[PDB]
């Protein structure tokens, strides 16, 4: 049995959010789904669970009267709903599975956590950072683009465009600025280009070096001179 | 060429504050600015504040001000960075990174691109929570580990209902440990579990490499309270 969750989610404080985990093994009606959640470098927090035969479902006492889980079972998918979101919300959201058929029909939400999902991120922040494709992947020699588009303001003329690669553990370094222009030793295996509202980066000729995160960067060309950033895309080369 | 040197990982309570500095080891500190970026683990980039060493002057963004100012000292070269009323939420890695400055005279523009960046300084704010694991545990190959949890006589003292959790990152929790002492299939039996008054325990034996990862417990909250209750988690490294 596999649990697929929605994709990641990018919300602004004060609205709410729908995460779904549909299961790919039948006899819905035998589990419980439980949603656990985890804060980026923090621990596992339980919110409630739901049992499809009964119709119930319970909440921790923190979430009580912002979560409401539901269960569909003509397509075998549980649903979660956070309401009220604010800054400390952000996290990765997981749904697991408990058999009843092992653990009894009495003691559940108990803690018998088998299969998981893979994880649903979600975002919540006043300043929203500019909107990158999660992730990208790409066999060597091939070319790939990665474009930064402005989200709730958007990019313009007036906007300084940097690119920035970062591999696990170290620090970012500087891919491109000016929007096209490539600092001293980076090679012309990297491009970019800005055009209206989006900003693109190219690399060709991949090789596994290659490999890592990037992010866009936007400065000045608004009425509050400030940075911003793109939330990341992850880069795959496959060898 | 020029190197930015930042100070050592820090462990704060949340409602305290906590000061990074970033060290210039070569060229003069009047002609650039210097930024700090922070990013969560797994997370993004987030711009943070500035200052120009000159000017004396530091600009935060909306979200840190009134909990985040940056000064310097032009005679060791340092930058320094102070956020106060600290909460979970700020548990991230802090970078300072150099902006070019230019000017005209009495107007000053700067570059918008930075190089170069610190190598980062992590800061861990957490909490305690409702069972108490030793926040990180150090074995070599072969020998033996146990990391203990502790909670009240409502969830491990009253039940025994308790699982353990292995969670590699980037990857989902992994059970490897339920009813305080069964293993589930496909897990080696290097992994065992106990159970006494209040507290629970895993053992690894024969610790592989692989075995370097988070392991959360948890417990049946009582039947007065539905649900489950999670260990902070514990932080496993093998010295190879």
């Known amino acids: 049995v596999q649990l697929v969750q929605s994709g990641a989610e990018v919300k602004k404080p004060g609205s709410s959010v729908k995460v779904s985990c549909k299961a790919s093994?039948?006899?819905?009606?035998?589990?419980?789904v439980n949603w656990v959640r985890q804060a980026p470098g923090q621990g596992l927090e339980w919110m409630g669970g739901?049992?499809?035969?009964?119709?119930?479902?319970n909440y921790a006492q923190r979430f009580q009267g912002r979560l409401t889980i539901t269960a569909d079972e003509s397509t075998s998918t549980a649903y979660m709903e956070l309401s009220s979101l604010r800054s400390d919300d952000t996290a990765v959201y997981f749904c697991?599975?408990?058999?009843?058929?092992?653990?009894?029909?009495?003691?559940?939400?108990?803690?018998?956590?088998?299969?998981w999902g893979q994880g649903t991120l979600v975002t919540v922040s006043s300043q929203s950072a500019l909107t990158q494709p999660r992730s990208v992947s790409g066999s060597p020699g091939q070319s790939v683009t990665i474009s930064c588009?402005?989200?709730?303001?958007?990019?313009?003329?007036?906007?300084?465009?940097?690119?920035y690669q970062q591999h696990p553990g170290k620090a970012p370094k500087l891919?491109?600025?000016?929007?096209?222009?490539?600092?001293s030793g980076v090679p012309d295996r990297f491009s970019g280009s800005k055009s209206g509202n989006t900003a693109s980066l190219t690399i060709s000729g991949l090789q596994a070096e290659d490999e890592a995160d990037?992010?866009?960067?936007?400065?000045?060309?608004?009425?509050?001179?400030?940075?911003?950033?793109?939330?990341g895309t992850k880069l795959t080369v496959l060898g | 060429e020029v190197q930015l040197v930042q100070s050592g990982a820090e462990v704060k309570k949340p409602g305290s504050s906590v000061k990074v500095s970033c060290?210039?080891?070569?060229?003069?500190?009047?002609?650039?600015?210097?930024?700090?970026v922070r990013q969560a683990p797994g997370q993004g980039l987030e711009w943070?504040?500035?200052?120009?060493?000159?000017?004396?002057?530091?600009?935060?963004?909306q979200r840190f001000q009134g909990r985040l100012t940056i000064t310097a000292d032009e005679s060791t070269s340092t930058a320094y960075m102070e956020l106060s009323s600290l909460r979970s939420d700020d548990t991230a890695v802090?970078?300072?990174?150099?902006?070019?400055?230019?000017?005209?005279?009495?107007?000053?523009?700067?570059?918008?691109?930075?190089?170069?960046?610190?190598?980062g300084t992590l800061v861990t704010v957490s909490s305690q929570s409702a069972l108490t694991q030793p926040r990180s545990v150090s074995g070599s190959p072969g020998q033996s580990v146990t990391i203990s949890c502790t909670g009240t006589?409502?969830?491990?003292?009253?039940?025994?209902?308790v699982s353990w959790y292995q969670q590699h990152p980037g990857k989902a929790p992994k059970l490897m440990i339920y009813?305080?002492?069964k293993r589930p299939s496909g897990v080696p039996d290097r992994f065992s579990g106990s159970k006494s008054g209040n507290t629970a325990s895993l053992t690894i034996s024969g610790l592989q490499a692989e075995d370097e990862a988070d392991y959360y417990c948890?417990?049946?909250?009582?039947?007065?309270?539905?649900?489950?209750?999670f260990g902070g988690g514990t932080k496993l490294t093998v010295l190879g």
């Open positions: 093994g039948g006899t819905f009606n035998r589990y419980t």
């Open positions: 009813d305080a002492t």
């Open positions: 739901i049992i499809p035969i009964f119709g119930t479902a």
């Open positions: 006589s409502s969830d491990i003292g009253g039940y025994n209902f």
């Open positions: 697991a599975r408990e058999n009843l058929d092992n653990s009894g029909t009495y003691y559940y939400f108990s803690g018998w956590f088998d299969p």
């Open positions: 948890c417990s049946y909250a009582g039947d007065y309270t539905p649900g489950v209750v």
